[PDB]
Write a protein that binds this ligand. Structure first.
Ligand SMILES: [Li+]
Length: 188
C-alpha cells in the first residue's frame, strides 16, 4: 500500500570476520545507519535495512532487517538485489548507511526528475552517488543477470539499466560520506 520502500544499505561480505561495522558507529549517540533510516522515514512510511553482520543489534530499532542471499554476490548491487527479492512493491529508494545528512526532499526530487527512466541516482555537483538511487522493480531481473554473470561494477550497471544522475549540487553537504571512524570524529 505505499509507492517507494526506503532501504538503508548497511553492507554485506564480512570478508575478514568483519572488522568495523560502519552502520553501527555512533554519531551524537546514534548509529549512522539510524540517522539514515530516520531521514528516510521523514519522507517514506516503509523503511527497511540491509545488514549482514550483528543483525540483532540492527533489529533492536524495530525495522525489518534483510540479509543477503547465500549467493554472496559482490559489492553494493548484491544488497540491492537481496532487498528486491525480499520486499514487494514497485519502487525502492536505496541509501548507504554512511550519509547521515540526506535531505527530506531526496525521494521527491529523484521522483520529479526520473523522466521515464527506471533508475535515477544522486549527483552532488562533484560526484555520483550511484547507491543513493531510486530504482523501479523492473531492474530486478537485469540486476540478477548482471550479478550471475559475475559482474560487480555499480556505475556500469546503472548505465546499462538506462538510469541517469539527478543534480542535487544545490543541497550543500547533504551527501557528505562518513567513511571511517577518523572521519566520524570530525562531525561530532
Ligand atoms: Li565482531
Amino acid at each position: 500500500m505505499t509507492t517507494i520502500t526506503g532501504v538503508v544499505l548497511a553492507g554485506g561480505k564480512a570478508r575478514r570476520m568483519g572488522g568495523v561495522d560502519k552502520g553501527l558507529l555512533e554519531l551524537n549517540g546514534k548509529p549512522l545507519w539510524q540517522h539514515v533510516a530516520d531521514a528516510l522515514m521523514t519522507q517514506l512510511s516503509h523503511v527497511v535495512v540491509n545488514a549482514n553482520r550483528h543483525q540483532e543489534i540492527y533489529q533492536a530499532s524495530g525495522l525489518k532487517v534483510i540479509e543477503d542471499s547465500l549467493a554472496d554476490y559482490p559489492g553494493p548491487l548484491a544488497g540491492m538485489l537481496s532487498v528486491m527479492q525480499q520486499e514487494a512493491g514497485e519502487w525502492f529508494l536505496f541509501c548507504p548507511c554512511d550519509t547521515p545528512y540526506i535531505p527530506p526532499d531526496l525521494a521527491a526530487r529523484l521522483n520529479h526528475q526520473r523522466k521515464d527512466a527506471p533508475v535515477v541516482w544522486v549527483h552532488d555537483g562533484e560526484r555520483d552517488h550511484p547507491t543513493i538511487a531510486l530504482v523501479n522493480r523492473a531492474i530486478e531481473p537485469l540486476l540478477l543477470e548482471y550479478l550471475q554473470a559475475g559482474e560487480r561494477r555499480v556505475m556500469v550497471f546503472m548505465r546499462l539499466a538506462g538510469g541517469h544522475a539527478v543534480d542535487f549540487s544545490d543541497h550543500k553537504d547533504a551527501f557528505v560520506n562518513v567513511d571511517t571512524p577518523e572521519e566520524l570524529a570530525r562531525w561530532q
